[PDB]
Amino acid sequence: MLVAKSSILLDVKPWDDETDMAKLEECVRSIQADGLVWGSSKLVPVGYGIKKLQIQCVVEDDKVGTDMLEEQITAFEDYVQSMDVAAFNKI
């Protein structure tokens, strides 16, 4: 833990291949907050066409919660099929 920070990996499923991943992957990043750090995202293909919307973030221990990020990322019901959690621990 650098300085009172943590790592939380999120995983969201796109409605379909139509779901502009570039936007989903971007929007996710675009999202900004106080003490909110955006790390590198990951991809996980289920079988071409569609892919997983996995991304990593670095919150401040318990300062920046996923609640917001979720309400922001999953705020798009026209892209996010169903958000979930990949884990919850420090960075």
Structural domain boundaries, residue 7: 1-91
Closest by alpha carbon to 16, among 85, 78, 75? Answer: 78
- How far apart CA 80 and CA 15 sit, in angstroms, is 6
The domain that holds 51 is classified in CATH as 3.30.70.60
Closest by alpha carbon to 85, among 58, 60, 59, 55? Answer: 55
**Beta strand extents in the chain (DSSP E only):** 6-14, 37-45, 51-59, 80-85
Q: How many independent structural domains does the chain possess?
A: 1
- How far apart CA 72 and CA 86 sit, in angstroms, is 17
DSSP letter at 35? Answer: T
Q: Which residues of 5-34 are buried (b: 16+ CB within 10 A; e: fewer)?
A: bbbbbbbbbbeeeebebeebbebbeebebe
Per the listing, tokens 């996980």 go with 44
